[PDB]
Scaffold this active site. Structure first.
Site, mmCIF file in Angstrom:
data_model
loop_
_atom_site.group_PDB
_atom_site.id
_atom_site.type_symbol
_atom_site.label_atom_id
_atom_site.label_comp_id
_atom_site.label_asym_id
_atom_site.label_seq_id
_atom_site.Cartn_x
_atom_site.Cartn_y
_atom_site.Cartn_z
ATOM 1 N N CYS A 1 23.566 -7.729 -2.142
ATOM 2 C CA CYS A 1 24.800 -6.948 -2.110
ATOM 3 C C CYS A 1 25.930 -7.773 -1.497
ATOM 4 C CB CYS A 1 24.608 -5.662 -1.311
ATOM 5 S SG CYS A 1 26.143 -4.724 -1.087
ATOM 6 N N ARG B 1 28.542 -6.037 1.754
ATOM 7 C CA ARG B 1 27.961 -5.607 3.024
ATOM 8 C C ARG B 1 28.903 -5.705 4.215
ATOM 9 N NH1 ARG B 1 22.844 -9.116 3.495
ATOM 10 N NH2 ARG B 1 23.714 -10.278 1.702
ATOM 11 N N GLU C 1 31.636 -5.778 -12.446
ATOM 12 C CA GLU C 1 30.488 -4.966 -12.834
ATOM 13 C C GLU C 1 30.770 -4.222 -14.125
ATOM 14 O OE1 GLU C 1 28.289 -3.096 -9.399
ATOM 15 O OE2 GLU C 1 30.254 -3.363 -8.463
ATOM 16 N N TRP D 1 31.837 1.615 -4.027
ATOM 17 C CA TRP D 1 32.888 1.511 -5.024
ATOM 18 C C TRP D 1 32.631 0.240 -5.819
ATOM 19 C CZ3 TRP D 1 34.391 1.794 0.295
ATOM 20 C CH2 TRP D 1 34.623 0.551 0.898
HETATM 21 C C1 HEM Z 1 31.135 -0.313 -0.583
HETATM 22 C C2 HEM Z 1 31.302 -1.084 -1.665
HETATM 23 C C3 HEM Z 1 30.150 -1.879 -2.329
HETATM 24 C C4 HEM Z 1 30.376 -2.921 -3.132
HETATM 25 C C5 HEM Z 1 31.761 -3.500 -3.508
HETATM 26 C C6 HEM Z 1 29.102 -3.431 -3.580
HETATM 27 C C7 HEM Z 1 28.909 -4.506 -4.422
HETATM 28 C C8 HEM Z 1 27.703 -4.779 -5.020
HETATM 29 C C9 HEM Z 1 27.501 -5.512 -6.249
HETATM 30 C C10 HEM Z 1 28.634 -6.121 -7.111
HETATM 31 C C11 HEM Z 1 26.180 -5.574 -6.472
HETATM 32 C C12 HEM Z 1 25.495 -6.219 -7.688
HETATM 33 C C13 HEM Z 1 25.159 -4.974 -8.528
HETATM 34 C C14 HEM Z 1 24.522 -5.300 -9.849
HETATM 35 O O1 HEM Z 1 24.819 -6.391 -10.406
HETATM 36 O O2 HEM Z 1 23.726 -4.456 -10.351
HETATM 37 C C15 HEM Z 1 25.495 -4.860 -5.407
HETATM 38 C C16 HEM Z 1 24.130 -4.698 -5.261
HETATM 39 C C17 HEM Z 1 23.482 -3.926 -4.312
HETATM 40 N N1 HEM Z 1 24.086 -3.121 -3.361
HETATM 41 FE FE1 HEM Z 1 26.069 -3.175 -2.893
HETATM 42 N N2 HEM Z 1 28.095 -2.666 -3.019
HETATM 43 C C18 HEM Z 1 28.705 -1.684 -2.243
HETATM 44 C C19 HEM Z 1 28.030 -0.706 -1.539
HETATM 45 C C20 HEM Z 1 26.669 -0.598 -1.329
HETATM 46 C C21 HEM Z 1 26.005 0.458 -0.577
HETATM 47 C C22 HEM Z 1 26.751 1.651 0.085
HETATM 48 C C23 HEM Z 1 24.679 0.209 -0.605
HETATM 49 C C24 HEM Z 1 23.507 0.986 0.050
HETATM 50 C C25 HEM Z 1 23.681 1.833 1.077
HETATM 51 C C26 HEM Z 1 24.480 -1.019 -1.346
HETATM 52 C C27 HEM Z 1 23.275 -1.627 -1.590
HETATM 53 C C28 HEM Z 1 23.086 -2.523 -2.613
HETATM 54 C C29 HEM Z 1 21.811 -2.985 -3.106
HETATM 55 C C30 HEM Z 1 20.408 -2.575 -2.590
HETATM 56 C C31 HEM Z 1 22.052 -3.827 -4.110
HETATM 57 C C32 HEM Z 1 20.948 -4.518 -4.928
HETATM 58 C C33 HEM Z 1 20.759 -3.614 -6.135
HETATM 59 C C34 HEM Z 1 19.683 -4.137 -7.049
HETATM 60 O O3 HEM Z 1 18.845 -4.959 -6.589
HETATM 61 O O4 HEM Z 1 19.679 -3.713 -8.240
HETATM 62 N N3 HEM Z 1 25.699 -1.466 -1.796
HETATM 63 N N4 HEM Z 1 26.463 -4.394 -4.539
HETATM 64 C C1 W82 Z 2 19.542 -5.247 -12.432
HETATM 65 N N1 W82 Z 2 20.657 -4.556 -13.091
HETATM 66 C C2 W82 Z 2 20.205 -3.203 -13.461
HETATM 67 C C3 W82 Z 2 21.359 -2.448 -14.073
HETATM 68 C C4 W82 Z 2 21.591 -2.527 -15.443
HETATM 69 C C5 W82 Z 2 22.651 -1.832 -16.009
HETATM 70 C C6 W82 Z 2 23.478 -1.066 -15.197
HETATM 71 C C7 W82 Z 2 23.253 -0.994 -13.824
HETATM 72 C C8 W82 Z 2 24.153 -0.152 -12.987
HETATM 73 C C9 W82 Z 2 24.744 0.951 -13.593
HETATM 74 C C10 W82 Z 2 25.595 1.773 -12.873
HETATM 75 F F1 W82 Z 2 26.168 2.834 -13.463
HETATM 76 C C11 W82 Z 2 25.856 1.492 -11.542
HETATM 77 C C12 W82 Z 2 25.276 0.387 -10.925
HETATM 78 C C13 W82 Z 2 25.624 0.192 -9.465
HETATM 79 C C14 W82 Z 2 25.564 -1.194 -8.835
HETATM 80 C C15 W82 Z 2 26.391 -0.935 -7.585
HETATM 81 C C16 W82 Z 2 25.915 -0.145 -6.533
HETATM 82 C C17 W82 Z 2 26.720 0.098 -5.419
HETATM 83 C C18 W82 Z 2 26.217 0.955 -4.275
HETATM 84 C C19 W82 Z 2 27.995 -0.447 -5.378
HETATM 85 C C20 W82 Z 2 28.430 -1.219 -6.454
HETATM 86 N N2 W82 Z 2 29.663 -1.766 -6.467
HETATM 87 N N3 W82 Z 2 27.632 -1.430 -7.514
HETATM 88 C C21 W82 Z 2 24.410 -0.443 -11.644
HETATM 89 C C22 W82 Z 2 22.187 -1.681 -13.259
#
Ligand code: HEM
Ligand code: W82
Ligand code: HEM
Ligand code: W82
Ligand code: H4B
Ligand code: H4B
Ligand code: ZN
Lengths: 409, 413
Positions: free
Chosen positions: A108, A111, A285, A280
């Site tokens: 993430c 953070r 993304e 957000w």
């Molecule tokens: C507040 C604004 C936040 C931003 C801008 C942000 C940004 C991102 C982005 C760009 C990713 C990559 C997502 C993807 O490619 O699927 C990510 C992954 C992730 N975020 Fe954050 N995030 C936010 C909040 C949070 C919160 C609130 C949590 C949990 C309490 C969190 C936990 C995670 C985790 C666990 C991943 C890994 C997801 C996975 O392995 O599929 N994030 N975040």
């Molecule tokens: C390993 N990728 C799995 C995958 C594939 C296709 C779509 C998605 C996906 C679809 C969604 F509507 C939303 C997301 C959220 C990723 C995320 C989570 C948080 C907390 C903040 C942020 N800024 N972003 C991920 C995830």
């Protein structure tokens, strides 16, 4: 030993001591690195050590390690695992553990916000209707009319594995995807299978391109049940462009709230299999992955058409040109509608600042370069040049099996 | 370790199965508890260390020519073994040198261009004795590889290490680079990354023209002696002026680049032998120039000036003015090389070819080590196929390795 990480653009060197606390495996060995693998492969007996370690770090975090309160809690937890084979977290421990699972999420980039997280305790929930209510309150709170607020809602922990609470949706808000007779796909092609499960369970699909999927909610191991999120709760943004007036005619929109609902939250050896969390968006993304992945909405062709770019040779970089304009439009649209969004330059800047903070006060920051570097313009963001160490700290967010592969109806 | 490891492509669902990792030799830097996959850099061999390293390589070579266990295989093993016994080292046959060099490229996990690995011209310079002779060999390499713009991959291999005090080294990190000059006011002229090497050259006697694109001289060390300066004949250094197919003003920036990328600071290890001077060259991927050389903040850093001439709003990052200018700069680099008929490959074509290469290697060889952090291009990552491709990274030998910079270790005569 102490490990050093260098930023090759600034020459700043940081020293990591925090990795000395890690426990879970990374997936790598001394001979094989699995850093680009997306998914590398209780009982009373295993549970108390995990509980002890977590209570220990909680009471160390509030600076009362070894206190009488610490001692009593350890005893209290031991007796409870003895007589019940599990234990219940205190409210304060639940909040601390949820914030630190975010803090420890190596993938993430957001953070820097980790300590500003609204935790909704839903451990008294017993039915899918109750889950629905809790999730609606989460969505409304986190959306906040466009001024998005990070939140997590935590449902009852796993007991025997046969009474799992699960959100079957992978994210709370997603668009449906439909297999067309003529072979192509309307909507979001990633969600074709889940959309089919909802239809098979009674959902009446509008068969549009941006149909918000219903919630499919499973409480206490029972069959999941369908619910329609009230539409006034689902904030959306029509995508237009600050210079290309034809861009709005593409008909594109997206939702404001990114809310992961398929992960597992581990705290002190307890497993919370339903813990939807939201923040957000970073613009890429939506603009790079959701729209331009070949297996998703896949709109580069159409946009490059309307830009009248030469699409006969790849070396014209027509794909790269259309990609930038699409991501300009996404950021412009959210900003014009006062919906919280961050661009990848600002987000990666903040993450470098966050790493600096964490090395100073905590002795490190686990970070997965493969996920942290944005999917476009990589090396003109500062994380590209930042060495990162990846290691697993707990409390953590983990992946789990999809419920439709395990559930007995 | 398990016998079969699987990698998935998340865009195509293709699953590949790797067994070649069972032959991995040295260490990655990672452990069970920590992954060092984004860390850039995570005395001689004794008779006892050398015996098994040589047998492993000789076994592999004879297996590759379908003669494993043959009389020529056992005889070569015995000849090598006797030679290590009496001399503490051994000499590679020409066939084995060529095989070894091609396989060090084949095994180079950070190289996206390996579909070409078996088409490498190997120049055997193990008879070289002086820096003048090294200059001759390198000049012939440059002329052969440049080929008037029809670039051909090549490697030139100088004598192996003996006691570690007679090393052959090219002190240049790459054969062709531009000088950088630090100004008293703190500004830099030319390539800011090369200020240190440029000062060494100046100290050694180089008269610097002090321009923006001055080809650096070669600084060549033979047999552990003090290094010596030589100017590459300018007619051997092919250069491309960068212009843009649409922006007439882009040529007014005065940018150009050299056609030949030639790494000269790496160490080639074959069968436990160490070739400390082994310059090798291929052809450029456009992003190496357009993204890294030109737009890295610590390099030529032209994004601002290009954004200015593009009349972009540069006050908010969310306008993506940087991204917009980066694309136009990379369009110009590809357009300028193609127009001058100098071999270059865009990042879309190169990563597509790498996927096809990796799949073939999985099917024919049982795997293909790859470092995702280096394979994915520095722009537009996720619209290239390698972004979605899971990779396994591990170290196979023969291999190219990093080595200390020679000015940090040389004992001046
Ligand atoms: C507040 C604004 C936040 C931003 C801008 C942000 C940004 C991102 C982005 C760009 C990713 C990559 C997502 C993807 O490619 O699927 C990510 C992954 C992730 N975020 Fe954050 N995030 C936010 C909040 C949070 C919160 C609130 C949590 C949990 C309490 C969190 C936990 C995670 C985790 C666990 C991943 C890994 C997801 C996975 O392995 O599929 N994030 N975040
Ligand atoms: C390993 N990728 C799995 C995958 C594939 C296709 C779509 C998605 C996906 C679809 C969604 F509507 C939303 C997301 C959220 C990723 C995320 C989570 C948080 C907390 C903040 C942020 N800024 N972003 C991920 C995830
Ligand atoms: C023929 C066309 C070739 C192409 C298109 C190509 C492409 C690339 C690229 C883009 C990189 C990353 C460079 C960087 O970011 O600094 C790289 C690295 C590398 N290449 Fe290739 N390459 C080619 C030929 C060769 C040859 C002929 C060899 C050796 C015989 C080779 C061995 C390597 C090695 C060892 C690396 C790692 C460099 C390092 O760690 O600094 N490549 N290649
Ligand atoms: C960790 N980066 C080290 C670094 C830093 C700054 C510049 C360079 C560098 C400078 C050059 F003149 C040339 C190169 C070529 C890299 C390369 C090598 C080959 C064989 C084919 C190719 N296509 N490309 C790399 C390398
Ligand atoms: C910190 C990080 O490892 C470093 O910036 C790497 C990332 N990937 C790279 N990839 C390539 N091809 N070349 C590089 O110089 C780098 N630099
Ligand atoms: C194979 C590779 O691990 C996979 O494509 C990863 C790469 N990095 C990523 N980074 C982010 N933020 N999100 C992703 O889905 C991925 N996918
Ligand atoms: Zn690793």
């Amino acid at each position: 030993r102490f490990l050093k990480v260098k930023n090759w653009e600034t020459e700043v060197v940081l020293t990591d001591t925090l990795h000395l606390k890690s426990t879970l495996e990374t997936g790598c060995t001394e001979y094989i690195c699995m850093g680009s693998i997306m998914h590398p492969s209780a009982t009373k007996d295993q549970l108390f050590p995990l509980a002890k370690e977590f209570i220990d770090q909680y009471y160390s975090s509030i600076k009362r390690f070894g206190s009488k309160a610490h001692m009593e809690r350890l005893e209290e937890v031991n007796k409870e695992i003895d007589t019940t084979s599990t234990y219940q977290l205190k409210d304060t421990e639940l909040i601390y553990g949820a914030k630190h699972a975010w803090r420890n999420a190596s993938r993430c980039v957001g953070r820097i916000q980790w300590s500003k997280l609204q935790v909704f305790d839903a451990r008294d929930c017993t039915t899918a209707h109750g889950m629905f209510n809790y999730i609606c309150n989460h969505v409304k709170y986190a959306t906040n009319k466009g001024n998005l607020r990070s939140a997590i809602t935590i449902f009852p922990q796993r007991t025997d594995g046969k009474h799992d609470f699960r959100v079957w949706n992978s994210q709370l808000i997603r668009y449906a995807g439909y297999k067309q007779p003529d072979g192509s796909t309307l909507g979001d092609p990633a969600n074709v299978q889940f959309t089919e499960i909802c239809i098979q369970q009674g959902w009446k699909p509008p068969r549009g391109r941006f149909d918000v999927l219903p919630l499919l909610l499973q409480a206490n191991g029972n069959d999941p049940e369908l619910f329609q999120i009230p539409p006034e709760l689902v904030l959306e943004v029509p995508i237009r462009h600050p210079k290309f007036e034809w861009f709005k005619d593409l008909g594109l929109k997206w939702y404001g709230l990114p809310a992961v609902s398929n992960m597992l939250l581990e705290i002190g050896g307890l497993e919370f299999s339903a813990c939807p969390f939201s923040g957000w968006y970073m613009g890429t993304e939506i603009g790079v992955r959701d729209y331009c992945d070949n297996s998703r909405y896949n709109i580069l062709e159409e946009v490059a058409k309307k830009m009248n770019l030469d699409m006969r040779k790849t070396s014209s970089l027509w794909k790269d040109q259309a990609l930038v304009e699409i991501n300009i439009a996404v950021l412009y649209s959210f900003q014009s509608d006062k919906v919280t969004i961050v661009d990848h330059h600002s987000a990666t800047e903040s993450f470098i600042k966050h790493m600096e903070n964490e090395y100073r006060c905590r002795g490190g920051c686990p970070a997965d370069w493969v996920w942290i570097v944005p999917p476009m313009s990589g090396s003109i963001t500062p994380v590209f040049h930042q060495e990162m160490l990846n290691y697993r700290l707990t409390p953590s967010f983990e992946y789990q099996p999809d419920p439709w592969n395990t559930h007995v109806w």
